[PDB]
Amino acid sequence: TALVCDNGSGLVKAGFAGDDAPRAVFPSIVGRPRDSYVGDEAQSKRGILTLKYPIEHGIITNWDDMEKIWHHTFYNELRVAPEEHPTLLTEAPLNPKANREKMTQIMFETFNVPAMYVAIQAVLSLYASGRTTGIVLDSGDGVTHNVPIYEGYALPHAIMRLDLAGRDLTDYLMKILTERGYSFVTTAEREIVRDIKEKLCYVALDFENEMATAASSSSLEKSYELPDGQVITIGNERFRCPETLFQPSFIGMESAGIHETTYNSIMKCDIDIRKDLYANNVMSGGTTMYPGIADRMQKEITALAPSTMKIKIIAPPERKYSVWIGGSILASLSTFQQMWITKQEYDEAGPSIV
Amino acid sequence: VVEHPEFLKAGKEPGLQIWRVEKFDLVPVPTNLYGDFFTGDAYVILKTVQLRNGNLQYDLHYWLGNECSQDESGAAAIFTVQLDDYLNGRAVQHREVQGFESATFLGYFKSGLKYKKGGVASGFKHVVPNE
Numbered sequence: 001t002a003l004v005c006d007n008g009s010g011l012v013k014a015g016f017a018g019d020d021a022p023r024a025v026f027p028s029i030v031g032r033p034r035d036s037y038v039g040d041e042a043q044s045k046r047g048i049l050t051l052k053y054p055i056e057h058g059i060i061t062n063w064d065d066m067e068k069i070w071h072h073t074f075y076n077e078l079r080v081a082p083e084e085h086p087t088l089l090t091e092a093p094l095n096p097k098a099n100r101e102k103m104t105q106i107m108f109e110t111f112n113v114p115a116m117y118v119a120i121q122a123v124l125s126l127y128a129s130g131r132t133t134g135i136v137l138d139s140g141d142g143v144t145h146n147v148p149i150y151e152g153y154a155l156p157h158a159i160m161r162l163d164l165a166g167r168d169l170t171d172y173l174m175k176i177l178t179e180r181g182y183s184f185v186t187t188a189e190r191e192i193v194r195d196i197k198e199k200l201c202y203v204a205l206d207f208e209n210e211m212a213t214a215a216s217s218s219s220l221e222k223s224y225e226l227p228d229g230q231v232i233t234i235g236n237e238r239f240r241c242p243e244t245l246f247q248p249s250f251i252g253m254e255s256a257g258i259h260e261t262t263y264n265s266i267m268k269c270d271i272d273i274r275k276d277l278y279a280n281n282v283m284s285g286g287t288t289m290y291p292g293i294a295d296r297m298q299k300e301i302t303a304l305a306p307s308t309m310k311i312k313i314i315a316p317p318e319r320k321y322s323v324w325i326g327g328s329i330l331a332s333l334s335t336f337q338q339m340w341i342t343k344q345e346y347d348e349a350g351p352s353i354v
Numbered sequence: 355v356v357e358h359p360e361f362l363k364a365g366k367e368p369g370l371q372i373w374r375v376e377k378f379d380l381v382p383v384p385t386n387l388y389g390d391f392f393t394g395d396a397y398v399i400l401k402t403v404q405l406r407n408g409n410l411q412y413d414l415h416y417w418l419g420n421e422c423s424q425d426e427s428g429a430a431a432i433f434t435v436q437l438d439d440y441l442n443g444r445a446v447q448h449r450e451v452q453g454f455e456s457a458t459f460l461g462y463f464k465s466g467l468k469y470k471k472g473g474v475a476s477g478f479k480h481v482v483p484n485e
């Protein structure tokens with residue numbers, strides 16, 4: 001049975017083609033002493049380990065550590081002999097061929113997989129939504145991408161990248177949370193802020209009005225009970241965290257907001273298919289999970305684009321695993337048999353085959 | 355490229371060819387049932403036109419039923435791209451949703467379009483992350 005691995009900057013999603021969800025989801029972290037630990041086990045012993053993220057902004061930068069992530073994925077997580085399973089791996093859009101070459105070489109030469117295939121994350125997400133044309137807003141832990149896609153293929157010139165995502169958001173919430181008096185500095189407390197971000201944060205339909213409402217009543221305030229018993233209150237930080245997506249300025253980035261990069265990306269594609277991009281904005285990624293993000297994006301984009309144009313945002317309820325699901329469907333198709341790359345063909349052609 | 359039998363039979367002669375996605379596979383619909391779609395399934399439609407100038411014309415439509423499962427609508431979408439790739443990309447792709455089919459699509463069926471409850475079952479095995 002084919003395996004499907006979606007190597008994100010923060011979480012690795014892994015499972016079996018045919019399943020509607022990844023069986024394994026763990027941190028993309030490798031820890032080494034003074035001979036290595038991965039994911040939760042790496043975090044358990046963070047005290048005696050130097051922790052590193054092998055994937056930076058969706059791009060693999062540490063091959064020695066990436067190898068440990070894959071070893072842990074196959075053996076510990078899935079409990080399977082790599083040599084008996086065809087493997088589908090995902091990659092960030094505009095990923096350097098050298099990287100795709102290294103990826104392939106490691107799979108075949110160190111894990112001896114019988115066959116493999118590398119798919120672009122944004123395109124798998126679009127397939128999962130039952131579309132061949134549209135534009136994907138892909139937002140995770142380490143990067144956000146705007147990928148317009150026409151008839152199955154990502155339009156190279158129009159792709160946009162924004163190095164701001166979930167981790168940055170967590171960092172910001174932690175920052176404005178202290179200002180409000182509270183304090184989460186240590187590594188152990190940062191997990192608390194992430195839980196607050198995922199449980200209480202949301203996108204305001206209108207930032208200005210929410211700021212007003214919050215300075216007057218306490219109608220927007222939600223309580224968050226700490227483990228030790230304490231109960232801290234969160235008010236405007238709920239929608240100020242996600243606001244950073246539309247206004248990267250909050251964290252000091254002259255960068256354009258996600259509504260802005262979506263519009264610019266659509267604007268760099270043939271005008272004839274623009275009506276289609278506008279009506280097929282698909283969002284995928286943990287960081288697009290905030291409640292109210294569809295409505296905001298819906299309003300922000302019609303403000304930018306000409307009023308006669310019809311805007312439609314598709315925000316799938318499981319968009320956090322959309323990439324993995326699209327690959328699960330892809331690697332299950334009777335046609336996928338031919339598009340693999342076999343170990344045999346690799347032994348002859350080498351890296352230049354992927 | 356695909357050795358998949360149906361890809362070899364695609365767009366070889368003027369006409370209409372319909373497939374239904376069934377457990378991650380493209381299965382041809384009996385000719386006599388053309389126009390009858392299971393609202394819980396997904397299909398791929400290929401229309402080939404005779405263009406005098408020895409210029410065969412192709413239009414690929416993937417129809418999504420209101421109760422078709424994610425794995426089906428996804429497969430219909432993917433099959434469409436592979437079939438088009440197979441046909442050298444000469445086909446124009448079209449997403450058709452139940453109830454809102456394009457005027458072009460509806461025209462392929464002289465005696466109207468007819469829906470019907472039911473369908474083949476999802477090829478998706480259910481699981482819950484980290485369990």
Ligand SMILES: Nc1ncnc2c1ncn2[C@@H]1O[C@H](COP(=O)(O)OP(=O)(O)OP(=O)(O)O)[C@@H](O)[C@H]1O
Nearest residue numbers: 008009010011140141142143166198285286287289
């Ligand atoms: N309900 C939620 N609300 C807000 N954020 C969430 C939610 N669930 C998960 N997240 C966040 O989304 C981010 C993760 O996504 P994903 O799993 O999409 O990232 P990756 O695949 O790890 O990273 P990348 O795409 O950058 O390579 C995390 O930083 C996490 O905090």
Ligand SMILES: [Ca+2]
Nearest residue numbers: 394395473474
């Ligand atoms: Ca069905």
